[PDB]
Amino acid sequence: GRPANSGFYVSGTTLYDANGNPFVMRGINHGHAWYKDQATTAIEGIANTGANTVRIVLSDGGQWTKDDIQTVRNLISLAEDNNLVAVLEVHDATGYDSIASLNRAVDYWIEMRSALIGKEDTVIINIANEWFGSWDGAAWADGYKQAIPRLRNAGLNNTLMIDAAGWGQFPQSIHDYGREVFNADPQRNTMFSIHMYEYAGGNASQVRTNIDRVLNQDLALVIGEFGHRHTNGDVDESTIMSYSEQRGVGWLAWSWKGNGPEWEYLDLSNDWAGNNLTAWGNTIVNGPYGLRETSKLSTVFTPTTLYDFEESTQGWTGSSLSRGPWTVTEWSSKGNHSLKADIQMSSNSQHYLHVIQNRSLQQNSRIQATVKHAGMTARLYVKTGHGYTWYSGSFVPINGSSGTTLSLDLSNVQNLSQVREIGVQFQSESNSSGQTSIYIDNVIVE
Template sequence: MEKLIRLSILALGIICQAILYAKEKAGEDVRIDKKETVFKVSDVDGFKVDGAKLLDRCGNEFVMRGVNLAYTWFKSSAYTQLEAINKYEANAVRIVLGDGAKFTADDAASVRKIIDKCKEYGMVAIVEVHDATGSDDINDLVKAANYFANMASVLKGTEHYVIINIANEWHKSSSAANWKNGYKQAIPVIRNAGLRHCIMVDAGGYGQNASTIHTYGKDVLAADVENNILFSIHMYGSAGNKKKIASNIDGVINQGLALCIGEFGWYHSDGDVDEQQILSYCKEKNVGWLAWSWYGNGNPVEYLDVVKDPSSDPVLSSYSNISINNWKNTKTWKASSDWGKTITDAWKAEAKKANLDKCETSDNNK
């Protein structure tokens, strides 16, 4: 029953994304700062941003090709899933954690264990708190930041293989100013704890409202004493066509801000997702991506699973002419995809491992 409740909560959060996107006003004015602002590059011995690039500890550009792992809800099979992800040659894993507000808090020992296993496999660990999903309350965001601050003794020294994604999809409303103000309060909590990691910041609007970054991304970056922020856009209903995908991405990187696609699927209840365009445009622009998600999506979004089972040798997902209802249950689409093969083939073709230990001069460190 507890598992079903967790799956239902996960499904509800994803459905809420669709509701929010459907309610957004068309043609909303977006302020994009065209001025060249030069931010000093952090000297941290770890991941850092340099303009629109994410660099590893050796100064090499790192482009994520990975997936989301629902760790906090599937602890019993998490390490088996991680083994399988490594076999398919991903170079990064975004790990779902709980801070105790909605989900059971993951303690420091368990966090250290999972991030060290990622490092053993040569995969970068992106740790994120899922409890603040969809909240507009800055206190919830600060609570998530404090969760990581309280783990400073465990996280210090992991800057070269861990990125801190403070909160998954915090902020659902259309107020970009509140999104900005929230992160201007939360980021110093991390820094005041002595953590110099690259920090990932999700866009507002359940991660899909890229205009929050377009408008206030530089303000958020300027609020960080390390100038070490990687922005993240989630692409579901907001990524239904080539023009929208390009404008969302270009509106960030053309300002000299670093970006990854922190979540995306191949279809959703608010319409089609052009996953092939996401993959091709990210490749063209050297933008990282993390598919949602490896395993464990509940009804009605189980079609987002990359694999059919949580084993070390899983069956890749393939969906043929399945029915997908919109969020109002007033329309049904038929859709097909070799989702699992699409994602894992892209890893094998494009994923290069970061330098997580020593620096090497080889051009191919895969």
């Protein structure tokens, strides 16, 4: 932020991969330009988190050491070899209003075109990180209206990504002029990015409205950068992650490692290898709506009852659901109600029903729940600690005629006093397809 003192294509609000399958970015930003020797270690580390995309910081020589074409080719290779989509971006014009800085970035992409042309199915070009620091939508648009044509004229066919003005925190620029910028692309293959920090994502209302204001212009969107907090305030990362999942919006967390003292709290990993994630890193990778739960690789590469649901859904949510969850009387194992959700099955597809809530299950030694579907397998799980550490039983077969009781032994679970989430992971079989419903009832601990 500013000082404290045949390939990808866009269709409406959806970004599609080369196979015609929607692609929802779930990834991490890596500050390559400042730490060039960490390329292999960092990208492999990021791949291990389950991320499906890595945004790579490049320098065109304006402020740091220019990344030459061999470096660009190597970075793309590392991403590809690890099944990661690469969003490349030039960082030297960050916060600048000058057309000169933007033109230098454009000249850079043109110079490196031989490493980008032919990589349309795996590489997306983010023209310039946070170009135009002022909050002026018209001036911002004028810059890109001249830049986009230049890029296309040079032969670049990659999907282009455009950062909003105001250091990325002025999404109104996209709502007001995004369509004009998009129409400046003869290939109509441009998407937009918001950097949600303390101004653009300060609270739940801002996160939702800012995302809606870009999408309602029928433009594809990604939260290119976001954190759990920033220079002048808190950032609602929880809503960014939950709402982005609801609306199919991509996101990329900032950043793997290497932030300066003023922003060191934004490092996702303590080590370059990624063997020791920070709390922020665990929120992104292992937390609710995180990488482990929602990231899908581009297809180009591939005794007390806690919940009875008798009066409400009791705070439960889920992911990879078509509709729901709802509390219904259609089926139940205890009382007259159960939690129900609809899902679309696909080969080995995974679906979730979970209650995100801090609580203590200390003293408890077991947790179980009864589930069923309208083949499938399922397992009960819990997450504990600041690291959202996962603990689950083994996947067991469930059926559609009656309920199957799932169980998890808590005797060996650490930090039970710090439970963060409780849920059931449903997994379709290899030859499973079609619509069905999943249910859960009588969640009890002893």
